[PDB]
Amino acid sequence: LLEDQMRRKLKFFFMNPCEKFWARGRKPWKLAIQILKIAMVTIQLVLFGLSNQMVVAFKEENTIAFKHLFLKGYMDRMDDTYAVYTQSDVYDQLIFAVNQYLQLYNVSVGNHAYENAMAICQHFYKRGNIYPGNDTFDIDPEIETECFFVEPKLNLTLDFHRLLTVELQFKLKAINLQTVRHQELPDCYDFTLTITFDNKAHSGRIKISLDNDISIRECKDWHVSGSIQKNTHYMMIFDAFVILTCLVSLILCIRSVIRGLQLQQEFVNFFLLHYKKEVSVSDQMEFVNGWYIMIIISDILTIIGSILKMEIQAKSLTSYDVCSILLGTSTMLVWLGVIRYLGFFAKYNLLILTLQAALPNVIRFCCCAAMIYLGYCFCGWIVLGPYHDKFRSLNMVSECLFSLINGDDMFATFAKMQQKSYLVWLFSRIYLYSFISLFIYMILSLFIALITDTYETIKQYQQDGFPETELRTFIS
Amino acid sequence: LLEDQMRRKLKFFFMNPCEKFWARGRKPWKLAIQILKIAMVTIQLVLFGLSNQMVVAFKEENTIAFKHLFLKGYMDRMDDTYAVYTQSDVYDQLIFAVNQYLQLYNVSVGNHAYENAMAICQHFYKRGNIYPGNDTFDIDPEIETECFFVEPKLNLTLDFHRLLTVELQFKLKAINLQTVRHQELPDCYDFTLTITFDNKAHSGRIKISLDNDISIRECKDWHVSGSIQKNTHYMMIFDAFVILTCLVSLILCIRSVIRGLQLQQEFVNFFLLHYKKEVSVSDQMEFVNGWYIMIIISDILTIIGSILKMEIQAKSLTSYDVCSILLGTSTMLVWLGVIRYLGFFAKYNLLILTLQAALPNVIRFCCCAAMIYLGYCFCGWIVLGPYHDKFRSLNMVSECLFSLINGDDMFATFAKMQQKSYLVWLFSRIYLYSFISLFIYMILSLFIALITDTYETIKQYQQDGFPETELRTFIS
Amino acid sequence: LLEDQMRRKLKFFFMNPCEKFWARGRKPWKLAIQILKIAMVTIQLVLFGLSNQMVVAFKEENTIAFKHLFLKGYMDRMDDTYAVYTQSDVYDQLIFAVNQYLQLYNVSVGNHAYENAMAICQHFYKRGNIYPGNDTFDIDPEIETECFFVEPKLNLTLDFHRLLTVELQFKLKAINLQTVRHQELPDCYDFTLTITFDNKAHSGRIKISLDNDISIRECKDWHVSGSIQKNTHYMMIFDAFVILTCLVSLILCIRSVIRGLQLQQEFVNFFLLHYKKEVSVSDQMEFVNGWYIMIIISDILTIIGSILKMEIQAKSLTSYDVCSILLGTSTMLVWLGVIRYLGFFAKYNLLILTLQAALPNVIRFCCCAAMIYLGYCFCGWIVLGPYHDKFRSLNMVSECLFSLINGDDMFATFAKMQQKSYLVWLFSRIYLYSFISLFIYMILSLFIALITDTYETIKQYQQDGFPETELRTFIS
Amino acid sequence: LLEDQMRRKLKFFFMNPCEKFWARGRKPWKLAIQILKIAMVTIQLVLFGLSNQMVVAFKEENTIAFKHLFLKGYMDRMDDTYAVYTQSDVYDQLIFAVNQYLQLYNVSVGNHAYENAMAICQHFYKRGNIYPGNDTFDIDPEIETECFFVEPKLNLTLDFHRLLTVELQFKLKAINLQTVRHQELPDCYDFTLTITFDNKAHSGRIKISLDNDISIRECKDWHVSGSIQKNTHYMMIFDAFVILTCLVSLILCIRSVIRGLQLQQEFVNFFLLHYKKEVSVSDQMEFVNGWYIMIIISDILTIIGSILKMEIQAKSLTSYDVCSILLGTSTMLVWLGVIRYLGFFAKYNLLILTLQAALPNVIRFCCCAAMIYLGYCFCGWIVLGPYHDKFRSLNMVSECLFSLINGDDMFATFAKMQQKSYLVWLFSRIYLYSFISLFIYMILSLFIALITDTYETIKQYQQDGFPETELRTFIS
Numbered sequence A, B, C, D: 001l002l003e004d005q006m007r008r009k010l011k012f013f014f015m016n017p018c019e020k021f022w023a024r025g026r027k028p029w030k031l032a033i034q035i036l037k038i039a040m041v042t043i044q045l046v047l048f049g050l051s052n053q054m055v056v057a058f059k060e061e062n063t064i065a066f067k068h069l070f071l072k073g074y075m076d077r078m079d080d081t082y083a084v085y086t087q088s089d090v091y092d093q094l095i096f097a098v099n100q101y102l103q104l105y106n107v108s109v110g111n112h113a114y115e116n117a118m119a120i121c122q123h124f125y126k127r128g129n130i131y132p133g134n135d136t137f138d139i140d141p142e143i144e145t146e147c148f149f150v151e152p153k154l155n156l157t158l159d160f161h162r163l164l165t166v167e168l169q170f171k172l173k174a175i176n177l178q179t180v181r182h183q184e185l186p187d188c189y190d191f192t193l194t195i196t197f198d199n200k201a202h203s204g205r206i207k208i209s210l211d212n213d214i215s216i217r218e219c220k221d222w223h224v225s226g227s228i229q230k231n232t233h234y235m236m237i238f239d240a241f242v243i244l245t246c247l248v249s250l251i252l253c254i255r256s257v258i259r260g261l262q263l264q265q266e267f268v269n270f271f272l273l274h275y276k277k278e279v280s281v282s283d284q285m286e287f288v289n290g291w292y293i294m295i296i297i298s299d300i301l302t303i304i305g306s307i308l309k310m311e312i313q314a315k316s317l318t319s320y321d322v323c324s325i326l327l328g329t330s331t332m333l334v335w336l337g338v339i340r341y342l343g344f345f346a347k348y349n350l351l352i353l354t355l356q357a358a359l360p361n362v363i364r365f366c367c368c369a370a371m372i373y374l375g376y377c378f379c380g381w382i383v384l385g386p387y388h389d390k391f392r393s394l395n396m397v398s399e400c401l402f403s404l405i406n407g408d409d410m411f412a413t414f415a416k417m418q419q420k421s422y423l424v425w426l427f428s429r430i431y432l433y434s435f436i437s438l439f440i441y442m443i444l445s446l447f448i449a450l451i452t453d454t455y456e457t458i459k460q461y462q463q464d465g466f467p468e469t470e471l472r473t474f475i476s
């Protein structure tokens, strides 16, 4: 009958292993292109990560060597957050830094060379008038930058209370030999340096640092072993081929989505002429694969990630952030997607059967426990903020109470109180003993017991059929 | 009948979602004022926390800049607990500190200025006579403070064995620009400084520190951008409106408490004329809402917290401790109170059904395990106190054995023993191996198994009715 | 009958709450003396701990002040394990230390004074002959100490390869004011100092340290506030009273032990004339209380602990180690013993019902898992000993694998490898990934599941009687 | 019948306690040689570990003393990874190191003496031409080492951009007295030193270190206490005896393997003539003991380990790595093997019954969760690599996410972000909050619930027989 026709095509709509569906009758390979996609996407991501990692290593080493070249009294391994608290000391610092830049060729071991320029920016208030003795001040809140230019020993005067910030900016060129000679990547390193003196807090605490922005290019004229060389970028082609595969498994699985859609309304509309039932929810959910949706999303993300890696390599800005985040989140979703093809073996379906059956319940529970958490987190923030080093911004408080839910860095917290206000110090102890002894044992063990319970129920589903659907009664 | 009348009003006394009670017949909004309360109380607490946080940031920066201005050989990032062990060194220190205060205008970068005064307090024993060679001493235990006053290089003599303490006290005024210009808060900073030399232990170990007390005020005459300004405090009004809302949800829920009270004796006294049973416990407990009690408590605490924030802002002492603790504990209870309105959805009641059904049992268990804990904690204190850095005061021992219950900072503990007394060193290892291997696995896993078990029982309550009460038999 | 007579006295042999036994007919108080014992023993232990703690605090402060007085280039907070690697440096060190001792009165802030003496011990080999160039050495392994005595600048010659060790020994007297004036404790502090130079390893690494031995006495002639004083030790009397109470609850509970014994053979021998069964095990176990045994043991330990605290206070050696360990382990057992009297309430018996029913099974399991642990611990020791900072002695390896069972200091371990030998470095990672991923999840979760299971079974015992004993069938 | 004959010999093939098999009729001892093996193998491994440990202690002390003798400005306890950033500083360093080697006899405390030689290796590029100003470079990538030899103050010129590395190599002989005099081990210590200056990264960051290779020998002419001595190595004989025992328990258990094999085909082939069933899997698995296999493997490994310890001691290279790994993994397997003889008691079989019944399921589960883990680990690597100190190489990322699964070093991770790129900084927080809150609670609690469940099933196996095998139906 009509019934048996439509249900008969349906029976092989749903054959879960594509091995099992093809087992009916022969179809040319699709799944092979998805395995190819995995191998591609991850080979791209690895080949990317290694290169980027070498460039980062070089920027790290160089910015360290700079920290010791241009910061007076940087301890020859490392010091950090170094600040100068007397105005004679700020003057001595400035004089030193500039004198190092001008004497850089005698001083430095590195191949650092100038570009063919030291910009001294001084940002002070338009009309600064401050008299803490009178307990009165008068200001116009503009910023006027009186600048300098130094060429490869000056005179300067800085009225300090007027002074908002200072800066030193000089370009330096470095050539990286190992990376260029061994492999083909751009090996010219332009370095912009900014030595900034934050007076913004106006605490009398002059804060110094050294910022490094590294813009890559290629050496125009380049000779290896007496010959000449030009870097051939094959990864340029490789990105392309990965966009191709990813596009194909975009399309094929889009058709796999919409075909099933039209079979879903085909099914439900069929169902009225005969049995006249609905399940607008159950078997619309059923036909949507939901793993195909993931393949499509990680596909889109891999396309845009690859394109951005391609422009970012060609035009060669090398900021890399928004490209890395995409091309990473994609491979995360792809490798996640491999679980289905583990599942075709059928000895592993439990993690994504119960992880899907656990979520509808946990989400409810999680919400209700999140109310407690917030109400806890605020009070921790304010009451503990003046004193405890960890509770300062609201977020850090979130990483404390999340660290402590998981029982990590505990005794640190009890011992980092300042003890200065006995009342508050004691409060913190009621706070932490409370939170730990509630949100670990009670709430956590309730949550974990919830998931394990769900695992029991899905276990005996795996043992005795499943919840019976009109579909799976009707396909059988 | 009479029965059906009283029970009939009762049926809608208990309609749990106020949505569900109003579902009967229309009532004007109350619950809306409770949601308004939440939004208020937390907006107050956040707007408070941010301001207080900025004031703390400024005090931190400044007291650091002071630590480096007035303490000889403070390493230009930080050193801590710095102490001077030769009397020549104490003299050099004092001379330095005073000389910095008098030269402060040449030295400092900050806008620190004097107030229109250096108080040198020297606290020595009345009749000090000490002769450790004779193994004999004679003292009269009074304290006589021979003081100084310095005005913007002295002669001083300190007999050291007589000397109990020393101090230097000088006011310094600092103006904070960023906070005043960007937002309206008091921006005058009075600083009292106390440089204290503890000889109290008389170990030959002279301990130094720098204490900072910051009293806020407002700049009398103040001009921004060529104009004049006066800070308008709207948060003054905001505190008021929050006291109002909080008072209203105090009153309305008090009536909600007592109304149910008179219905509880109305119910139980009714019950004698007919069925002649009691449940003096069960359904007196039932009528008291217990969530209304919380709303009332967090309400009181929010009232007093707000008033204290208001006086503390107006009169402007700015100690802030007892205000912060209240206004925090309140918002903690309020956000906790949100769980009920999550519960009206009815997919979340499990956490506060089982968290209430778990407490009567756990409390018993907890008590019995607390006996073990104390008996463990004392022996740890004394036997381990001379040697292990962590076990010193009794409390710290409490935070060790609580840290170790939760398995945090373990190898630290085994490695911090002093090994000097082999017998005791070995004892500590029997101690810790024992405690960990008992109080984690055995007692903890028993406790967690208790709560999870309770969760099972309340789960199948959620599945099949509840324990049957004469009330809920009688309302049905 | 005879049966009913003996069983009739037995029925009140076993009345578990002594409240419940006295409920029969009146008996004078015993249990009151046990509560008195608890209050005593712990008040003794606390009053002890505080005093000892103050003496430790003073020794700590003083030995620090010494470390900075007599060790050249001790950084004015702390340095640790400081060693001198050139012979010119050792000479300069020695000269400095001695010069400080002789100039101590100008130098020190403290009240340290000599006793009415600097002993320079030099331990060198009898016949030292060493020639690492010839790859040949000749020695006679004796120790001959050529000593000195210095009186308040020398000439010295040390042949270094012959030199085994050096030492400086000088007594210094310190008077502690706060403790004597505020409370009555001995306040004379004799200090023996030993500055030792370990050359024993003969690595060219000369290791220095400062050892402190503090012998207490009382100031002979002592005047407070113009009057005279002698410290009255009431704690001397207090120790006595505690020995008394402890002795009484020794005796009374010994009789409680042997009475039940003679009722146990009385019972079992009775049982042959009639029913002719044995339970040589079950109801010999039953009559022995097992809590009385604890009271007796903690009693003995409290007696000896108190006596040793009394001699150690009177004769006043003040080593304190073997006294502290006893008097601590006792109070640990006593406070543990309080659980029974919590149990008389009868809402708490579960922890010591199931903790006793869990032990016979766990002990078996524990043994079998200990085999795995040892076999793991050895291989960790040897294979990882040359490289990983943590695995060195066998014991430390035991505290690593115990730290890691409990999941504490993990990333530290993976990051502390030396990476020098790639093969071994990789081995350590198979080692740790293996051990963690076996001995946590598998073995630990098996153990914890064992205890929780036992808790289930004892729960439904608490619900439906118990295992039925011929006794408890026969007393009923 | 034939059936009863073969099954009758079989009944005592399988008697699990060899005590229980011998209980039939007397057999001479085998198991005694296995207990002897355990005692041997571990006594060898301990006696080895101690010796090796003393040699390591001496190398550690000496290489430290060297770090302070030859590295300018090594802080007299320790500094680490010390690097020199100006070419004047590199020159001063070199001059210092060499001057220390030549003056070593005045300088050092140790008995270090030369061997009867300072090799200065300088590795520079063949044709170095570098011009970072032109953004052009030309190189021929060879390495040409222009060397020196110094004999107990030079002139040197190093063109720095050409310079790849530098080195200083000098032998030093040290005699260790304590080890030779107290026990018989080789006590001559040859030290090769390499002071290496890595310029390889060409960051301007010249990295220095001190490498130590220690080759042991024996002192040719050696006299103790006026007499003469030659070290008698009895451990040479001891290794032999252990190889013997290990070989015997190799052979005997090989026969125990193959005998059971021929009884397995004897059994299955027998089974066709009568009942005609197979179980090619079940009872081929059954006859293979699987514990004998372990004894054989740990036996092989102990043989090769012992032989390598013997050659490595005689020829005396003392690299020790591949010997230690073997001789360790063996004793790990042996002590593991002890569990069976614990099992003969029969109160402990549960751990290796359920640990074997848990593995077939977990392995499936573990695989599927490993897919998630990898896909997570890559994205963590790349997206977090530029910034987070922990995520750098892929492996370290593996030890982060394994550290965090187990909840160790958490707050460290949230606080080690660089915050420089707000987008990425926020990403890391979605990353970590996600991973922790999925891979701990959900996946971990699922895994642990799996093992505990398996423990339940094997528990009630222990209670009611086992899965019934035609064998154990047929032997009965």
Ligand SMILES: *[C@@H]1O[C@H](CO)[C@@H](O)[C@H](O)[C@H]1NC(C)=O
Binding pocket: A105, A106
């Ligand atoms: C380095 O200093 C010398 C003088 O000491 C000078 O002759 C030389 O030009 C300086 N280096 C450079 C690159 O100018």
Ligand SMILES: *[C@@H]1O[C@H](CO)[C@@H](O)[C@H](O)[C@H]1NC(C)=O
Binding pocket: A131, A133, A134
């Ligand atoms: C107050 O302001 C006036 C400028 O009108 C200035 O001359 C005077 O010095 C100020 N007072 C102090 C204490 O600095």
Ligand SMILES: *[C@@H]1O[C@H](CO)[C@@H](O)[C@H](O)[C@H]1NC(C)=O
Binding pocket: B105, B106
């Ligand atoms: C700073 O020192 C100079 C002398 O070097 C003196 O003239 C000046 O008055 C000092 N500063 C102040 C604020 O007095």
Ligand SMILES: *[C@@H]1O[C@H](CO)[C@@H](O)[C@H](O)[C@H]1NC(C)=O
Binding pocket: B131, B133, B134
């Ligand atoms: C003992 O006290 C007397 C004062 O009566 C003093 O002169 C003498 O120096 C003291 N002894 C010592 C050793 O200081």
Ligand SMILES: *[C@@H]1O[C@H](CO)[C@@H](O)[C@H](O)[C@H]1NC(C)=O
Binding pocket: C105, C106
């Ligand atoms: C301290 O040194 C001075 C000389 O500078 C000397 O007169 C005095 O006696 C010394 N102190 C003591 C206690 O001898």
Ligand SMILES: *[C@@H]1O[C@H](CO)[C@@H](O)[C@H](O)[C@H]1NC(C)=O
Binding pocket: C131, C133, C134
């Ligand atoms: C070897 O020993 C002799 C003493 O007999 C000594 O003179 C000679 O210097 C030694 N050799 C070396 C290299 O020190």
Ligand SMILES: *[C@@H]1O[C@H](CO)[C@@H](O)[C@H](O)[C@H]1NC(C)=O
Binding pocket: D105, D106
């Ligand atoms: C140590 O230096 C002195 C000169 O101060 C010299 O005579 C002696 O020979 C040096 N040591 C050695 C072992 O040469």
Ligand SMILES: *[C@@H]1O[C@H](CO)[C@@H](O)[C@H](O)[C@H]1NC(C)=O
Binding pocket: D131, D133, D134
């Ligand atoms: C470019 O290279 C030439 C060598 O042909 C050299 O003379 C010139 O100085 C280089 N330019 C710079 C800026 O160093």
